[PDB]
Amino acid sequence: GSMEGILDFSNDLDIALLDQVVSTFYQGSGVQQKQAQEILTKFQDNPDAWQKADQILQFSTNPQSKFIALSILDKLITRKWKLLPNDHRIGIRNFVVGMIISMCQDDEVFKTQKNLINKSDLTLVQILKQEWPQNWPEFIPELIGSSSSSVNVCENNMIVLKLLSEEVFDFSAEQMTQAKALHLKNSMSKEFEQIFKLCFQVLEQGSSSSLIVATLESLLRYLHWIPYRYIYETNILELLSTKFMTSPDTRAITLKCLTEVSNLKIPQDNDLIKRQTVLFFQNTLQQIATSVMPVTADLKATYANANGNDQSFLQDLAMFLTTYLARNRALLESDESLRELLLNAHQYLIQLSKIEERELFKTTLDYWHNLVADLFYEPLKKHIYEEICSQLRLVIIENMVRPEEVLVVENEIVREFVESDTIQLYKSEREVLVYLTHLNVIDTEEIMISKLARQIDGSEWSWHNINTLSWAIGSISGTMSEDTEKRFVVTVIKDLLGLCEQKRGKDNKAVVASDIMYVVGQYPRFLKAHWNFLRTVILKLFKFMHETHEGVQDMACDTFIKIVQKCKYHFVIQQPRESEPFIQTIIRDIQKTTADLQPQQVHTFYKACGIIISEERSVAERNRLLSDLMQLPNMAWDTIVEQSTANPTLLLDSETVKIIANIIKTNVAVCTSMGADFYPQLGHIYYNMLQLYRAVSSMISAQVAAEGLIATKTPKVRGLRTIKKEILKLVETYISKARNLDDVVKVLVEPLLNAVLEDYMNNVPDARDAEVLNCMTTVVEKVGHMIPQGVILILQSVFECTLDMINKDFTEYPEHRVEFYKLLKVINEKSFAAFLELPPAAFKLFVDAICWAFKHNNRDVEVNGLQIALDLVKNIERMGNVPFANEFHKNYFFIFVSETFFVLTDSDHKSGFSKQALLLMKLISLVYDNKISVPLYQVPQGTSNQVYLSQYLANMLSNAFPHLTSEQIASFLSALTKQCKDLVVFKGTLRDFLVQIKEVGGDPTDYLFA
Amino acid sequence: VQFKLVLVGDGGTGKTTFVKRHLTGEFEKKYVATLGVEVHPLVFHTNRGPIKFNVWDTAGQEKFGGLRDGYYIQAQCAIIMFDVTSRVTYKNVPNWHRDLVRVCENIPIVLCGNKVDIKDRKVKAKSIVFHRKKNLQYYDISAKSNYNFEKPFLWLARKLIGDPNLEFVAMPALAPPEVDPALAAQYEHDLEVAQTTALPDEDDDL
Amino acid sequence: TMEEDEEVLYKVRAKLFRFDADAKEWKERGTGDCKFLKNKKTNKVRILMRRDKTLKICANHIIAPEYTLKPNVGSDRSWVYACTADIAEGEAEAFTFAIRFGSKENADKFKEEFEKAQEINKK
Ligand SMILES: Nc1nc2c(ncn2[C@@H]2O[C@H](COP(=O)(O)OP(=O)(O)NP(=O)(O)O)[C@@H](O)[C@H]2O)c(=O)[nH]1
Ligand SMILES: *[C@H](CC(=O)OC(C)C)n1cnc(-c2cc(OC)cc(C(F)(F)F)c2)n1
Ligand SMILES: [Mg+2]
């Protein structure tokens, strides 16, 4: 409607209309809310709206209106303060100060408009950051004096001081120059004596809760930086650990203050200070025991009930106890009069560790790791904690989370999907339980065997109980002696089988199956020494591969390969009492074993066989095993190759396409585990495989021509491209592991390039496989140095056409993007001569492509782009004083300098700062080391490149950042060039520049910080 | 029974995609930066009745920040979002938290690490600790795979209603109606287009 | 919940899409269990589908005999069909749906069940 009128500034501002626009935004909805929002944004962003700020704060009926007005002032103070004439600066100051005093003295405004007062306090702090103490030396003394005139003013002054400390000490690193932060830190440090005096007196005499809470909230911030003497040479620790722990209004903030007190490393030679550190802990634990909860209390229940602030308090208690004890528990471990305090604090932690809260459990678990690792090494300590550790063993065992390997889940015992939050937690639990087992292996075995005895009984049978126990049992593998482990493992399995027999129903069955599979897969040392059992296990895994339950099936395959990775040797030798190596038995029945598996599980099976086969180091025997393993896919391959040459229409059948893809996938799986040993099988299919690659390629092109680009979405063409992708993956997989690189070059490479390069170049973009680039990257990486002409061929076939795919936006063809710059990186690193052979027009596109990578926010591309630029510079520098290097610098030195400066300063590429700074330092150092032997300019004759570089950069920055003074730019560049050998200082100067360009009037002496 | 929820975090962390997933069920693949704020109502059905969130989805890009902390006034809860594939977005979490709690001193806040579906994770689980001292709840999430996508709202609803046993429940499913040959000759225009527009993510499990 | 007066004839996990005719894009509407429910009183069969964790309805409409399942150019495990009266979001809207399944066999079984339900509703 008529809301836009406030945007017209030739008017007088209709405060009533502004308040209606504001009310419509905050309390409205729908389209009218959306319209008011856009209007308010335009109002706030108007460069003169701040001149309306006083009138809004005087005449408005809406607190949100005043808030927005203060945001307009904040934006002015933060960015354009020093452009104002001095009278406007004094006017804004007096006006903000006056409004704060005004709101404080009206008791009903003080109670009802907390946000608006908080926003005003922050606004005042922004003025202090610009004006204090140089142009406001009396702020702190007057603040202290005014604190006695009113309790409201005293409380609000604590808020101002809290915000001031935060802005100076907690959030200055990214927001101020190094010099300005140092100046404000020194200013606050110089005046803190008086500040602490006011703070301690307020805490000591104690007014009412609100003033105390605000004073403690300010103290929490001071503790981040103030000298230790203020805490230990006063009586404040006794106030914090007694008086302020008793009242729940101050308990939360005081516990956080004491946590910060605890996270200092005291001068640990002073007996007096050690006594005080003990004392405030003793006091605090006494207050909790008497005023909150005794150590026997059920904190799990309390947390779950979530009354009032109980969850936050228990979180804060855990942080306090873990912080203090990780630093200071040694202070409590020798004095016998402190033993009760030490163990009571850990007993609270035991109770806190039973809470059902994932993130809190991780906090306590981090502490337990800290403790048990120390008990594992430090002499004479573990006996102190014997009872704590015993309880902890029980807590961990009962709260084990599901490991990666266990693929069966309750929803209904089903088969997941999925993640790593749980994976990291399992690993952290295992770490602590392993330590705990070493600390007392008898106690651990007794807890686990007793728990397992009660699953037999049915005393405590449940899916949850057999799962966590089985997972804990598997997780401690390697902690016991081989003999105890033997007895331990035997008992566990026999009993787990006692649960299967006594369980009925498949739901129950797939649970105990996953548990047995996890345990056995975790104890390969046992399996290696007991062949007859290992054989029985594998046979049973094979049975599981025929299971109707889908989860059991997948885990059997994963367990099979997990065991084989560790016990492979026992499958390759002929065992006693056996007629042949077990690998021969496995290969023979591979068709019957894998009949009910999905294809990708079949391929895992073949990969597991490849692991075993590679343990045979006799070449003739290994190649024969390899030949036997591939019998089924090779037979299918020969059949499908014979009925593909004649009648090239046969691949129209989608069922044929699936068969081919599965054949290649099987070869990929075996090549993954066999690596260099796979060569004889690759050679068996290589030439016909590349002919198939060409044939499928013609089919794809034919479909796109007959059906349009939409053909690439159809199941048929997607299946054909899977063939090409798996062929490329197979060749990439082998070459990445090949040991005979002569064979790679003479046998594999040239037929490969003939089959893939022109086909990629001459397909429409939507039909090009990014996997071609990935395969070529590996080819260049491994044998690039031996095929200089082949690398040139690669560039000619993929460079310009892929670049044209990805240089219109940052989003299309994301995989081509990533592989493209991976390929350029390796060519530039390993076959730089291929770029020297490029025509000048194409080399310019290469420079264009590198800078294009700079501007990506995708880290995959950005990082490689910055790395290529750095390597390219080094490649050029390595050439020395030759025509190509001279021409490169004349054509491209300043392009790289300015492009790097652009992404450094544009606020859209912060993730690359470190590598951008490295590149810029290298470029600058090239000039100030006189490594560029020709003039960079086209300015008088004889001028050094150092002089021209400074003039170029000064002009560049003057035009790009016209609000900077000439002295700012000159001082920045002088410091930056001085520092081009010291990356850390260099980067600090760049950071200072990024601060200064966001405001007006930055001090040029800031760049002398170093 | 409605509550104001402000959603903040660096640009590109997935704030808008996360809300859209809860609004319509879709996954928006494109990045269209939010300008200032977008307000959407969002209702969940629980065993304690319906709960309505007025979700203020704010802009993460500084040049599009609009009213910035002006959007936080009278928020009753919040979600702080970052991207586990971008360390800078986690490094900025304390800055978003600072500005938020200066306006909203005592509200429940969830910290969400989004995009855990991406293989090359960069902000490791072990390094995510900022929530501990600040009493924020934390979740790994993925708007793309829906991993834990319901957990932030479920936790906030339990805190705002004050019932730890609150659960999402199935809404009542009314009987659907029994229901044009005037345009039936033209609902092959609209249908053939749909038939010949391929479905997205055909390689997914569903 | 409004589901006790009904019998479950068929259940399958699926991902449901809706066609944005303006933007020319398919948009996901929900993933979860798709159920064919036969009303005990009227014998009419409807599709009812809820999202996995929020349990929110993403499909609720009669399996009309007028409807026809069509293939999508990009999938061998999906069906496209027009719907004139779906009340998952509120007031009965018309939609062009696509529903995709875990496998071609699930899509084929769904089509068989979808057509057996159309017969039931033609009484
Ligand atoms: N792989 C993946 N991508 C996601 C996920 N969530 C969002 N994205 C993607 O991240 C990009 C950013 O989208 P968006 O939701 O607008 O983020 P935003 O924080 O709201 N942007 P802004 O704050 O500037 O308005 C999109 O391309 C989106 O597809 C996710 O969970 N996984
Ligand atoms: C219980 C689960 C089960 O039987 O699943 C079937 C498929 C329904 N159960 C019974 N027997 C085992 C068992 C026996 C083994 O003998 C050594 C080995 C295993 C294995 F897990 F190690 F493979 C399992 N499990
Ligand atoms: Mg957004």
Author numbering:
A (entry chain C): -1 to 376, 414 to 446, 450 to 456, 458 to 977, 981 to 1052
B (entry chain A): 9 to 187, 190 to 216
C (entry chain B): 78 to 200
Provide the authors' own sentences about this structure as they appear in the paper:
Exportin 1 (XPO1/CRM1) is a key mediator of nuclear export with relevance to multiple cancers, including chronic lymphocytic leukemia (CLL). Human XPO1 is a ~ 120 kDa protein comprised of 21 repetitive anti-parallel α-helical segments forming tertiary protein structures termed ‘HEAT domains’ (H1-H21). The α-helices of H11 and H12 form a groove with hydrophobic pockets that serves as a binding site for prospective cargo proteins with an exposed hydrophobic NES. Due to the over-expression of XPO1 in many cancer cells and its role in exporting tumor suppressor genes such as TP53, development of selective inhibitors of nuclear export (SINEs) that inhibit the nuclear export activity of XPO1 in malignant cells has garnered increased attention.
The E571 residue is located within this NES-binding pocket in a position close to the bound NES, where chemical and physical changes associated with mutations at this site (most often E571K or E571G) alter how XPO1 binds select NESs on these cargos. Glutamate 571 is located in the XPO1 NES-binding groove, and the E571K mutation changes both the shape and electrostatics of this exposed region. The considerable change in size and charge resulting from this amino acid change may also affect SINE molecule binding within this groove. The covalent binding site of all SINE compounds, C528, resides in the XPO1 NES-binding groove within proximity of the E571 locus, the latter of which potentially contributing to the biochemical environment uniquely conducive for SINE binding. Lastly, crystal structures of XPO1 (wt or E571K) bound to several SINE molecules (KPT-185, KPT-330/Selinexor, and KPT-8602/Eltanexor) show the compounds binding similarly in each case, which was further confirmed by a similar cytotoxicity profile from this class of compounds in patients’ cells with or without an XPO1 mutation. Comparison of wildtype and E571K XPO1 with all three sets of KPT compounds gave pairwise Cα r.m.s.d. values less than 0.18 Å and XPO1 side chains were in similar conformations, implying that both wt and E571K-XPO1 will confer similar XPO1-drug interactions. In all structures, there was no density for the side chain of Glu571 in wildtype XPO1 or for the lysine side chain of E571K XPO1, suggesting they are flexible and mobile in the crystal structure and unlikely to make any persistent contacts with the SINE compounds bound in this groove. Furthermore, while the variable side chains of the SINE compounds are likely flexible (weak to no density), the trifluoromethyl phenyl triazole scaffolds are well-defined and bind similarly to both wildtype and E571K XPO1. All structural observations suggest the E571K mutation is unlikely to change how KPT-185, KPT-330 (Selinexor) or KPT-8602 bind to XPO1, and will have little to no effect on inhibition efficacy. However, by solving crystal structures of SINE-bound XPO1, we determined the E571K mutation is unlikely to impact the inhibitory potential of this class of drugs.
